[PDB]
Design a protein around this ligand. Structure first.
Ligand SMILES: Cc1nc(Nc2ncc(C(=O)Nc3cccc(NC(=O)c4cccc(C(F)(F)F)c4)c3)s2)cc(N2CCN(CCO)CC2)n1
Ligand SMILES: Cc1nc(Nc2ncc(C(=O)Nc3cccc(NC(=O)c4cccc(C(F)(F)F)c4)c3)s2)cc(N2CCN(CCO)CC2)n1
Lengths: 255, 253
């Protein structure tokens, strides 16, 4: 039903490697993003399993599936995000100019997309800035390109991947936004992280970040997954942040 | 007259910050739990002078004051904090319409006294309402909230008890939406222009039409067409018998 011929697609510029992700034109008018599969690395039935997930999910804050190519090489066609990954965006030229009102709005958009995933009873399992795509007018959309520092302890240790383990990951994503794409738990290795978070270690409040936003991060990092907040609460809290939580917020040198 | 030495009060835990000072939880004479508030000294002490004249059960009661700088305005302690934080927090999901209407009835009672005393609050909203034990709500003042202010008070500075009624209508949306910011998606600029052309917030989800009609009565273009807090108090106290006798609890209200 979602099938289209290869003749309609024209791969123009390569964006990432691993298969690989391209920027092209569908039917010679619509600018699209094409994720190709390198044969041998993964079977076509296992690669199209991701598109099966995208067929059931439809929201303004999720990367929208456009079409699929069942003939090898396998193509998964989606909408094009002009600014790339949130991680590269935060690390790049734009990072210096982004302040807390922009970063909280981006966080509110991600929380909205994840609030849909919550309602649909789906689990992302790899929520991070690298899996968030940025477009025009600071539009952020939840994606998956295919991460112990971002994974909840029960999910990393006992494989208990839930929407509450995604909430934990969203808490880590908040540190990425407030540190301008810096890797969580700086100086700590994957083994050091897993053992310290069990003993109750949590990342301290990032510099220039208000305590109220770090409290929200700490709510996302509660040992008991059931005690963690919903993405519905996170969306509402982040949308209303500069009126209800920080009305006396003053811009600084970085945040 | 209300004066007490500095050695009596002890500031233990910081509750709030910003504005002119800070709200602190402490102990007065080492027996009773109190709240202490740390602009010219004559301007800050003027707030405590107003509190000396206002005495009501649904108003934060003034206990003591320190005249010389640094000034310490001592009041009663509200264990649950601001109504906004209370609604936004863990308690929000459990609060239904009978509780929220009872809370609104208590705020209307406090504001009914304010009305009788010919006083104007000027900043009535959930952030200036404090919650205690057994859902006791008391009117407070922590010191622009255009979304809560009436058009005549925002544009022409015509601050009255009728403009406080407008603010109470917005507070009713805060209660029924569980602390959500009014006029969602709208900025203070497009709020003033839309409200002037006649725009009013629609009925919140699961909220009865009868409570939205009361919100709209508080939001009448002509301030003298707005109801009294005495009417608002009586309407909310009798709500589940006179207005909604066949009310059934839902998923959120
Ligand atoms: C790597 C990259 N991608 C860019 N844009 C993209 N737009 C869409 C992309 C993409 O990954 N599309 C795609 C293709 C196939 C499948 C998928 N699926 C998903 O991402 C996916 C999978 C499962 C679930 C979900 C969801 F929504 F639930 F969370 C999503 C997504 S990648 C731009 C860019 N830029 C850097 C280069 N500059 C300059 C020009 O070269 C432009 C910005 N760099
Ligand atoms: C900010 C905050 N205040 C709390 N409790 C409070 N109780 C009283 C407070 C207070 O503002 N007291 C105070 C001190 C000095 C002056 C004033 N005055 C007024 O508020 C005032 C001034 C003028 C007029 C009016 C009136 F009534 F007409 F409207 C009122 C009030 S603040 C608790 C709390 N929390 C609840 C639990 N804790 C942790 C417990 O360990 C965290 C949050 N958070």
């Amino acid at each position: 039903a979602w099938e289209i011929p290869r003749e309609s697609l024209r791969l123009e510029v390569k964006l990432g490697q691993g298969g690989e992700v391209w920027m092209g034109t569908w039917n010679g008018t619509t600018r699209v993003a094409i994720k190709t599969l390198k044969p041998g690395t993964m079977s076509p039935e296992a690669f199209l399993q991701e598109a099966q997930v995208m067929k059931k999910l439809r929201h303004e804050k999720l990367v929208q599936l456009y079409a699929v190519v069942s003939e090898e090489p396998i193509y998964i066609v989606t909408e094009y995000m002009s600014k790339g990954s949130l991680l590269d965006f935060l690390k790049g030229e734009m990072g210096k100019y982004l302040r807390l009102p922009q970063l909280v709005d981006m966080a509110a958009q991600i929380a909205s997309g994840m609030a849909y995933v919550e309602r649909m009873n789906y689990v992302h399992r790899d929520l991070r800035a690298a899996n968030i795509l940025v477009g025009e007018n600071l539009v952020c959309k939840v994606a998956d390109f295919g991460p112990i520092k971002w994974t909840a302890p029960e999910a990393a240790l006992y494989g208990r991947f839930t929407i509450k383990s995604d909430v934990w990951s969203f808490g880590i994503l908040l540190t990425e936004l407030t540190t301008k794409g810096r890797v969580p738990y700086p100086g700590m290795v994957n083994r050091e992280v897993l053992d310290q978070v069990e003993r109750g270690y949590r990342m301290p409040c990032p510099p220039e970040c208000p305590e109220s936003l770090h409290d929200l991060m700490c709510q996302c990092w509660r040992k008991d997954p059931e005690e963690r907040p919903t993405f519905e609460y996170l969306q509402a809290f982040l949308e209303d942040y500069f009126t209800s939580t920080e009305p006396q917020y003053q811009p600084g040198e970085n945040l």
